[PDB]
């Protein structure tokens, strides 16, 4: 099964180096016949093609970056990377690794992608607070409940319900910036009024950056 | 290089509807073009290449269209056209549904939040269709105004709707000053507006 893993910091400062690898598993890069390239998307915007490796190591760059794109390729360790200099918050966007078919008909394999923000602001990790359920939050024989992750930096966090047994009925907000530079988010979920008292619901909320992993249970 | 240009550049069309997108060169390089598919927190996902059942692609003037047959829930996402390392711009369908009212839960602020100085109230307006929708925040019967945040969910992939977060944020001794907090919610699904309160007692 074809895998595209990228790996590397999520906060770059301002006027500093960006760099991200991209594991290949599934197929090999040695030998292939594929560009080996990075693609990346700005919030709220497309795609826009960075560059672009063959396996001898010859490349191939947006004349949009002004010569400030590496690109590399470690055959032996089955890898390839981009270095990306003197990053402003122009800069902040997710960073997909992918790869094409040489030739006019190649279509693109895409890895999973990875948030790059370029800010000068320090890492924070989120507290983690309650959205009980009560008679305030049922309707019908339907229960609301929650968890709010307040004053993080930078995106993002990931927020699970019961170790991912509960998904049906979640709502994860996008999050907000607030005025003191921090981010912050709740998570919803909707369940049957009579599961209260009988079923534990935990939001288990994970902010890679600063090491943060948080399982908050949530009673009435 | 290319340019590739897309249109429509956003549509909302309704379940079953049938819908027809376009790609445009800026030159004629090659014959093939292909689509991705990306749905919300996700990579872009190749569709259909020309080169290789709702979905299929053809040709109109020098334009390449793709066709979805009866677009579905699930089809809501942005699609973008592709030859060699080229993309468009990307168009977004939405889907269109019939109204459906929020349901509209209160939370007040946890005691751990409290013991930090600061006190987050949260109103949820579960999914409601259109995404229009009035939040008022009164507290002691006097409307509130400045610090107040909203999130919105995209569009859910299986009835369409969207949900919605209003959070009032205060310090815990402008939380502490009054008794009663209540959001109000006007929306096109409702005959009137709805209230949910509680008191910080």
């Known amino acids: 099964q074809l895998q595209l893993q990228e790996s590397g910091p999520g906060l770059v400062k301002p006027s500093e180096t960006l760099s991200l690898t991209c594991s290949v598993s599934?197929?090999?890069?040695?030998?292939?016949?594929?560009?080996w390239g990075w693609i990346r998307q700005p919030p709220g915007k497309g795609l826009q093609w960075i560059g672009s490796?063959?396996?001898?190591?010859?490349?191939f760059y947006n004349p949009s970056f002004s010569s400030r794109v590496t690109l590399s390729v470690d055959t032996s360790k089955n890898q390839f990377s981009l270095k990306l200099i003197s990053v402003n918050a122009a800069d902040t966007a997710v960073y997909y690794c992918?790869?094409?078919?040489?030739?006019?008909?190649?279509?693109?394999?895409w890895g999973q992608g990875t948030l790059v923000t370029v800010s000068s602001a320090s890492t924070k990790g989120p507290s983690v607070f309650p959205l009980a359920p009560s008679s305030k939050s049922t309707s019908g024989g339907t229960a609301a409940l929650g968890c709010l992750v307040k004053d993080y930096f930078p995106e993002p966090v990931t927020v699970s319900w019961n170790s991912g047994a509960l998904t049906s009925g979640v709502h994860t907000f996008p999050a907000v910036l607030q005025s003191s530079g921090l981010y912050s988010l709740s998570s919803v979920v909707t369940v049957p009024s009579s599961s209260l008292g009988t079923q534990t619901y935990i939001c288990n909320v994970n902010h890679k950056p600063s090491n943060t992993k948080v399982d908050k249970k949530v009673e009435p | 290089d290319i340019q590739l240009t897309q249109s429509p550049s956003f549509l909302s069309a309704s379940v079953g509807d049938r819908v027809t997108i376009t790609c445009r060169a800026s030159?004629?390089?090659?014959?093939?073009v292909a689509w991705y598919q990306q749905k919300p927190g996700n990579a872009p996902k190749l569709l259909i290449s020309?080169?290789?059942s709702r979905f299929s692609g053809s040709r109109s003037g020098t334009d390449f269209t793709l066709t979805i047959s009866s677009l579905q829930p699930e089809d809501f996402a942005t699609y973008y056209c592709?030859?060699?390392?080229?993309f468009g711009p990307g168009t977004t369908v939405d889907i269109k549904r019939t109204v459906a009212a929020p349901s509209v839960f209160i939370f007040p602020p946890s005691d751990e939040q409290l013991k930090s100085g600061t006190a987050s109230v949260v109103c949820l307006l579960n999914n409601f269709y259109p995404r229009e929708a009035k939040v008022q925040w009164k507290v002691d019967n006097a409307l509130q105004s400045g610090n107040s945040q909203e999130s919105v969910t995209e569009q859910d992939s299986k009835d369409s709707t969207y949900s919605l977060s209003s959070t009032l944020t205060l310090s815990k001794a402008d939380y502490e000053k009054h008794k009663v907090y209540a959001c109000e919610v006007t929306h096109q699904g409702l005959s009137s507006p709805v209230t949910k309160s509680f008191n910080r007692g």
């Open positions: 992918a790869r094409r078919i040489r030739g006019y008909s190649g279509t693109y394999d």
């Open positions: 599934g197929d090999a890069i040695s030998g292939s016949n594929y560009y």
């Open positions: 490796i063959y396996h001898t190591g010859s490349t």
């Open positions: 030159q004629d390089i090659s014959s093939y």
């Open positions: 020309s080169a290789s």
């Open positions: 592709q030859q060699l390392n080229n």
